[PDB]
Structure 1
Amino acid sequence: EYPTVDDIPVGEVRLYKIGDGVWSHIATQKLGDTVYSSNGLIVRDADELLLIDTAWGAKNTVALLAEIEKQIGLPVTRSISTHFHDDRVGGVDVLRAAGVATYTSPLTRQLAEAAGNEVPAHSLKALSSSGDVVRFGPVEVFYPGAAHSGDNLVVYVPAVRVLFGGCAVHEASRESAGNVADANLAEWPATIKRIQQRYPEAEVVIPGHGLPGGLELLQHTTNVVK
């Protein structure tokens, strides 16, 4: 039942309920001969929605907003991108066109600018140091340190113990680190331990790509990395 590249019809976006007021969103991009999927999060707050990550590009992000309006019918008012790559900020301008207030850390804004990627309009302050946390509506945003990228953030929904790990966390089936061109492989183990120590009660851990699991994906990630 978790959506995969084998069942999301081409160009569509799917939502998947994780817990009370929490969905993941799943989108695809074909690169060469391989279709990839990518996850983000949607979190209800009162009568609005907080979006975590774009659906990887403008076309997909249009489809994401349509799917949200069809299935949930509440307005996305704010977003947070969890690092500077296209599966996180690609489609920010779509969000901005729709009236969404787009956020991310100052460093992610800088790296996104440097990469020629789309740039969220607003900075989350108080995230510049490893171990910094901030509250944001119904979530916590945590900067655990460098890993998949120098700026990677994780998002926790404390009411229902759902941790969205983004690409700092690998799915269970993944056994190679993947794209390390922006990664800090030396730091990535410490970064994972910081996540483990901060969110010991998490019930679900959602990787940036692939199937949800539990806290076991964190050590799995360290194992893949080292």
Structure 2
Amino acid sequence: SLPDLKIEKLDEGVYVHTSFEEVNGWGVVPKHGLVVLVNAEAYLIDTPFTAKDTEKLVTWFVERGYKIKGSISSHFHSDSTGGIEWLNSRSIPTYASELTNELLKKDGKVQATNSFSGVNYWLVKNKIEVFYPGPGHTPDNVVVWLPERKILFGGCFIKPYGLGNLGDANIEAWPKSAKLLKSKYGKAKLVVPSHSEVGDASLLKLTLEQAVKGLNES
């Protein structure tokens, strides 16, 4: 009996959604994503683990007057993409990078209906930016930046107290990718990881230290 989906306000127009799954070798894993409001329109930053929780999440915001304009998934693992099939069935636009869609396709999973390619991409120009720091947790992991609020969604790339599941990780590249992320977003007020609590910009530093440490054990 996994805990319920939770939705809590992080800042003006920015909510954190947390869903839960039992994953072998890890136990009950919490997963944070965002919902970002731009006027009367809501954007999902990562989907919950499941269709059920994705539907709950969507229902919560629609019942409060927000139209769901789209979702973006930060990498191909199901804790970011589990909801895409359900969103597609409701004609809600889903986005992922070209690489992410390729990895979903390779794994026989449903793909996002929209893809983007390149280091930077505006999901919503001047409001929601996507940035690729390079391989780390996965080859495809991206982060989402909210310039108006100085909030960085780091997804499963931000790992301040341990790197987590290394199955698809690029441990060689992660310290350099972390370095780039830190340089770009040292100015962040808040950094939102997938699996640990919201913090400030120090989470960027800690991730870099954890990545360097993980690489050291060769």
Quote the offset at 1:221 in angstroms.
1.3
Q: Distance in 1 between matches of 2:129 and 2:164?
A: 27
Q: Distance in 2 between matches of 1:11 and 1:101?
A: 28
Q: Distance in 2 between matches of 1:193 and 1:79?
A: 27
1:160-179 equivalences in 2 (<5 Å) = 160-170=149-159, 172=160, 174=161, 176-179=162-165
Q: Distance in 1 between matches of 2:33 and 2:184?
A: 21
Q: Which one of the candidate residues 130, 133, 144 is aligned to 1:144?
A: 133
Instruction: Report what 1:135 is aligned to.
Output: 122
- Does structure 1 residue 192 correspond to structure 2 residue 178? yes
Q: Distance in 2 between matches of 1:201 and 1:210?
A: 20
Alignment deviations for residues 86-129 of structure 1 (CA, whole Å, 9 cap, x no partner): 0111110111122210011110000111122221111113x2xx
- Does structure 1 residue 61 correspond to structure 2 residue 54? yes
Q: Distance in 1 between matches of 2:46 and 2:156?
A: 11
Moved over 3 A (4+): none
Segments of structure 2 that go 5 or more residues without pairing to the other structure are: 214-218
Segments of structure 1 that go 5 or more residues without pairing to the other structure are: 1-8
Q: Given the two structures, how large is their TM-score scaled by the length of structure 2? A: 0.90
Matched AA of 1:152: N
Q: Distance in 1 between matches of 2:183 and 2:208?
A: 14
Instruction: Report what 2:216 is aligned to.
Output: none
Contact 2:44–2:71 (Cα < 8 Å) also in 1 = yes
Quote the offset at 1:207 in angstroms.
0.3
Q: Which one of the candidate residues 142, 146, 158 is aligned to 1:153?
A: 142
Quote the offset at 1:22 in angstroms.
0.8
Contact 1:40–1:53 (Cα < 8 Å) also in 2 = yes
Q: Given the two structures, how large is their TM-score scaled by the length of structure 1? A: 0.87
Q: Which one of the candidate residues 10, 29, 39 is aligned to 1:36?
A: 29
Instruction: Report what 2:102 is aligned to.
Output: 110
Alignment deviations for residues 1-38 of structure 1 (CA, whole Å, 9 cap, x no partner): xxxxxxxx846211121111111111001235821110
Q: Distance in 1 between matches of 2:109 and 2:57?
A: 19
Quote the offset at 1:196 in angstroms.
1.2
Quote the offset at 1:160 in angstroms.
0.6
CA root-mean-square deviation:
1.6
Q: Distance in 1 between matches of 2:113 and 2:104?
A: 11
Quote the offset at 1:223 in angstroms.
2.0
Matched AA of 1:199: Y
Quote the offset at 1:210 in angstroms.
2.0
SS of equivalent to 2:204 = helix
Alignment deviations for residues 165-214 of structure 1 (CA, whole Å, 9 cap, x no partner): 000002x5x3x322111111111111111111111211000001121001
Matched AA of 1:48: E
- Does structure 1 residue 17 correspond to structure 2 residue 6? no
Q: Distance in 1 between matches of 2:107 and 2:204?
A: 28
Matched AA of 2:114: H
The number of residues matched between the two structures is 209
